Paper text:
[name] is a polymodal, calcium-permeable cation channel that has emerged as a potential therapeutic target in multiple conditions. [name], expressed in the plasma membrane of a wide range of cell types, is a polymodal ion channel whose gating is controlled by multiple endogenous lipids, and exogenous stimuli including synthetic ligands, cell swelling, shear stress, moderate heat, and ultraviolet light.
Three additional complex structures were determined in the presence of distinct ligands: the antagonist [name]-bound [name]-[name] complex in the closed state, the agonist GSK1016790A-bound [name]-[name] in the open state, and the agonist 4α-phorbol 12,13-didecanoate-bound [name]-[name] in the putative open state (ligands are abbreviated as GSK279, GSK101, and 4α–PDD, respectively). The diagonal distance between G679 backbone carbonyls in the SF (12.2 Å) is too far to directly coordinate cations, while that between the M718 sidechains (4.9 Å) is too narrow for ion conduction. We observed that D743A and D546A mutations of TRPV4DM attenuate channel inhibition by GSK279 in our two-electrode voltage-clamp (TEVC) recordings. Although the EM density for the ARDs in all three states exhibited high quality, that for [name] was most well resolved in the GSK279-bound closed state, which we used to unambiguously model [name] and map its interaction with [name]. We resolved GDP within the [name]-[name] signaling complex in the GSK279-bound closed state, and by including GTPγS before freezing grids we observed density consistent with GTPγS in the open state. The interfacial contact that associates [name] and [name] is mediated principally by electrostatic interactions between β1 and β3, switch I, and switch II in [name] and AR2-AR5 in [name]. Strikingly, most residues mutated in [name]-mediated neuropathy (R237, R269, R315, and R316) are clustered at the interface with [name]. Consistent with this idea, the all-atom MD simulations showed that [name] binding reduced the ARD fluctuation substantially in the GSK279-bound closed state based on the root-mean-square-fluctuation (RMSF) plot. Importantly, our discoveries of the human [name] structure bound to the clinical candidate antagonist GSK279, as well as the molecular mechanisms of ligand-dependent [name] gating will facilitate the development of drugs targeting [name].
Numbering used by the authors:
A (entry chain B): 752 to 799
B (entry chain A): 702 to 799
C (entry chain D): 602 to 638, 662 to 701
D (entry chain A): 152 to 601
E (entry chain B): 402 to 451
The structure:
Amino acid sequence: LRKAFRSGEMVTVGKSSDGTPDRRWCFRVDEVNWSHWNQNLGIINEDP
Amino acid sequence: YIILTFVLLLNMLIALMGETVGQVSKESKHIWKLQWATTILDIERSFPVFLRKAFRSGEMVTVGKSSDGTPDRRWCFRVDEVNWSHWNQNLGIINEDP
Amino acid sequence: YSIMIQKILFKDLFRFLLVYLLFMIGYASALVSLLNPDSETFSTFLLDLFKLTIGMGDLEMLSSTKYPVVFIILLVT
Amino acid sequence: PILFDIVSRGSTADLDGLLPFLLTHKKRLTDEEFREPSTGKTCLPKALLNLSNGRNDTIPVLLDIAERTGNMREFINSPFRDIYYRGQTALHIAIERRCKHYVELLVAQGADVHAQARGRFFQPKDEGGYFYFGELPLSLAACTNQPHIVNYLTENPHKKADMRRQDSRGNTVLHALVAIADNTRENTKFVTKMYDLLLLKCARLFPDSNLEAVLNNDGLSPLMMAAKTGKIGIFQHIIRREVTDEDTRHLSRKFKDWAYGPVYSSLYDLSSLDTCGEEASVLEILVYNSKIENRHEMLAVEPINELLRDKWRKFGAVSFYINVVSYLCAMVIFTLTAYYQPLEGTPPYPYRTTVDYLRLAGEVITLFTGVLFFFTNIKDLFMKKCPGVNSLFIDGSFQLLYFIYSVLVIVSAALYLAGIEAYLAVMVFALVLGWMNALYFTRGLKLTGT
Amino acid sequence: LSRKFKDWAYGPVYSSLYDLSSLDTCGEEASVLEILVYNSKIENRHEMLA
Ligand SMILES: CC(C)(O)c1cnc(N2C[C@@]3(CCC[C@](C)(Cn4cnc5ccc(C#N)cc54)C3)OC2=O)cn1
């Protein structure tokens, strides 16, 4: 039951050393920032 | 029974003492200001439209010529100040007389 | 301490007295309007009400004239 | 699969076959075979998202192939179809990525500079969305702090996005700029700058119109919208703004009347602050519909506190005190009428003595006051929306209590009609509640109000 | 070997996402959260939990 009610997603981060997927249970938080403009970018979804 | 009732009284006294008063000393001013303003506006809305127009704040000052030279004639409200730092910086453009 | 006594007597004591008088006069009218039998009796019953405020009174006096329940709630409030 | 990867890595070299292939097989890049089933994304948004150091070598080649194949128009502006990104155009991506060179290169060939990005993602934070920028390319450029793109979009030989256009919600560029406005310095610093820039530009181009006088679907305006949303940085800026340039000085709201030594008398414009119940004054919206957290600070701006004080002096104190006196007299009469009631007999009593006439006058005036309290309180409660927490202490509780007292008097009338025992049960409660309610009027005096 | 990634962005809206491989394990590998809430140092627990 605890596994069923597990917080976070099943997001895949990227290829591992051998190209295998990470598939790590993550937990997203979002923020609004007006100071640093287009500094770096979202590397994963590449779409909101 | 008696001791615990006294303890409840003491606890209530402490809670009113610190948490309530520290916040109140600041919040009461603002809540009263809001009450005052809303009562003023209610009193205004009680009166009829023509009476409200009669008791309208501000002047009927004319600001200047419009794009076609017509007068502005905007209901303004004057406030005045005393400043000793910036000397003769800009000047009164409208009355050109106190 | 003299300053404290003066300010306590003048600033907020009269304020509290005004509010206290407000509630007292409202309750006097409400309490005595219910009674069924007059200015002299009004004085006696006001004095009795003040006695109940200090902590001594007559239970039968409150229930003397009808509607004991409303009297109990009024006194509790 | 193949073409999306080719364009995704910026591989200009690998598009040799594409142009012969499209002609050979009578196919176009906008045909369904080349587009995402989920979102409908065509090659161009894919290329613009996968930007390598700000420049992808395939956008010009894709556009060249598109015109050579006959359908440039259908290609440059192809919207997304998934509910989450509906309406978003390649132009939106170009402007959002903050590359002026590609927005120019994309509008030069016929990009719709008015297409609306209205999918669920592009909605106000309160309505299930992460960014609301006004729902329009020019609003997108202005709301992400790119003044150069705004200057280009408004003025270019190909096609100009005019500043007066409204989106689906009715929000003009200025409502949109207010919507993103925040009270942090980093935000207000550029929000106010862009607001003034756009206002002056619209005034100069189109002289007759006033951009700030265009209302949205809700009937608000940029200032009136910032009043009820809790935006100090732009609200006070709008109130205090003065434009020195003679060309467009008329669109200012604070003027300098006169001066003498160190005495400067200026005068604020209250064209919208105080309207006298004709055009939805800003003051009423600020005092009723505003945000409770920041109302105390909205009410301290330079020309509002003095205005309220002046109105209090002119007609506020006398009316309030006259109200207090009338209420106290009415309750004194109510108490006297209650006291003199003969407790012996079942009503209605025969009114024959002059004392009985006095009692009847008291009885009827009591009902007149009760129905008056019902009338005005119900009008107020219907006029104003139901409040919640942090607003009950202001006024809600008193209209609640006044309603309860009026209801008690009304039921007292019904009982008094027939039932001897019943009516006395709660008519006393009426007096108790009324004397409790008399506490309302302490708000006139600050010492008693606290 | 990082534990905070940047999911996506759009204008001034950055959505990142933290790795909870060890914070929340669901009673399999001695989660960090249980140790932080029970066995931690009382003086500084209030700050570890923020
Ligand atoms: C004696 C007499 C006839 O003059 C009188 C006047 N007012 C009342 N109240 C007072 C009150 C209490 C709760 C807020 C209200 C509804 C706000 N509110 C709504 N309309 C307004 C008009 C003026 C004022 C003022 N000052 C306040 C007003 C007012 O509800 C009543 O019925 C009772 N008796």
